[PDB]
């Protein structure tokens, strides 16, 4: 696009991964204001409007909130406390023809300072004196629509930097385009914490025997305790059983009678009691009361 017609395009109901922007190995002035770039893909924001121009690269340091200049005064202005990312990279190899790229025609003069996030489109010329222009260009006409000269013999400061603005505004609307969410594989039949699509909890994920209609997203039983969460990749229905807990009780015949005791781990399977308590962290005197010949359920 052009700088007189950089449209405020609404690209909605999509995703946009930025790790391919991270390992592109061509970025120059990747600047994210407001939020860090390391927490940009996992969490998103609403109003995901975007802009595009190939701006000349010698005053990208002027592109800042609370900083004026030439581009900030006449081409593109940022508001204070910007939430969003401005991205600049080298554009020497592909937008460079012989004799200069005379297609990115740009405005040099405007009567007032630009408001932030305003697309300025015009045809009429700059007014600076008192004598009006009669259509024929004269001594104070001052034609603002000047030319970028982008030759291949320019240096990296004079060669242009391609700008895209992923601005994040705050309006009463949900987000449309966000970054991706990485996901690992699933484990089965284990007391494991999980991160599903919205809900997290502790329990044992087992195979199920019931069925779902295609609109239930999770499940629950009587006294508001959940029983099933949808896994949205494999399309096989899993359940939850809470992994086991309980009290312990110690059976003794008296300290005057003998020194031996019997320990009661209640309502558990009697195979995972070295996995239940930390038998590797406790004493070897405790480690002989987790397994042995006299294991009874």
């Amino acid at each position, epitope marked *: 696009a052009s700088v007189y017609a950089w449209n405020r395009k609404r690209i909605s109901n999509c995703v946009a991964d930025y790790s391919v922007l*991270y390992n592109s190995a061509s*970025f*120059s*002035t990747f600047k*994210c204001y407001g939020v*860090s770039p*390391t927490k940009l893909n996992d969490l998103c924001f609403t109003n995901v409007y975007a802009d595009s121009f190939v701006i000349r690269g010698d005053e990208v*340091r002027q592109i800042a909130p609370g900083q004026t200049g030439k581009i900030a005064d006449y081409n593109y202005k940022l508001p204070d406390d910007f939430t969003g*990312c401005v991205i600049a990279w080298n554009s020497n190899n592909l937008d460079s023809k012989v004799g200069g790229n005379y297609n990115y025609l740009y405005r040099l003069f405007r009567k007032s300072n630009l408001k932030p996030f305003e697309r300025d489109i015009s045809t009429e010329i700059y007014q600076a004196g008192s004598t009006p222009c009669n259509g024929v260009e004269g001594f104070n006409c001052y034609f603002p629509l000047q030319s970028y000269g982008f030759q291949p013999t320019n240096g990296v400061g004079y060669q242009p930097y391609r700008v895209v603005v992923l601005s994040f505004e705050l309006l009463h609307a949900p987000a449309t385009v966000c970054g991706p969410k990485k996901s690992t594989n699933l484990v089965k039949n284990k007391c494991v914490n999980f991160n599903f699509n919205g809900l997290t909890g502790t329990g044992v994920l087992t195979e199920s025997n019931k069925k779902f209609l295609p609109f239930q997203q999770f499940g629950r039983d009587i006294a508001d305790t959940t029983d099933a969460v949808r896994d949205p990749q494999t399309l096989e229905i899993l359940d939850i059983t809470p992994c086991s807990f309980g009290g312990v009780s110690v059976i003794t015949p008296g300290t005057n009678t003998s020194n031996q005791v019997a320990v009661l781990y209640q309502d558990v399977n009697c195979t995972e009691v070295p996995v239940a308590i930390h038998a590797d962290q406790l004493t070897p005197t405790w480690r002989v009361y987790s397994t042995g010949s006299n294991v009874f359920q």
Partner: nanobody
Amino acid sequence: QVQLVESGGGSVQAGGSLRLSCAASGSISSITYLGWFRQAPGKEREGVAALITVNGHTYYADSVKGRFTVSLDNAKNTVYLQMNSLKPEDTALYYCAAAAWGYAWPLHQDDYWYWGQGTQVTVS
């Protein structure tokens, strides 16, 4: 929240080697970009080396290209700057800067950096 302590300076004959290091303490995971600065006597402080912590990509200036290299050690949380084939125009004050807003090439003084205390590298 980011504190940088750098060392490894000294004096050496031209054609020798030196190795600078800059240790980072504080919010290590928020640091995204390490840049090495250099201010000659009678000159403005310019940029020499660049390093992205996430990607590992390196950028160098044209006067230090082919002679200077930069590396990162995530175990010690310390960036390294190894100097090979030194010339006596490199006598300057060296600075290490840590960035938490992303990566920006070339290096500029007016942007937000966590600045080091400055070290002296003298060659002749």
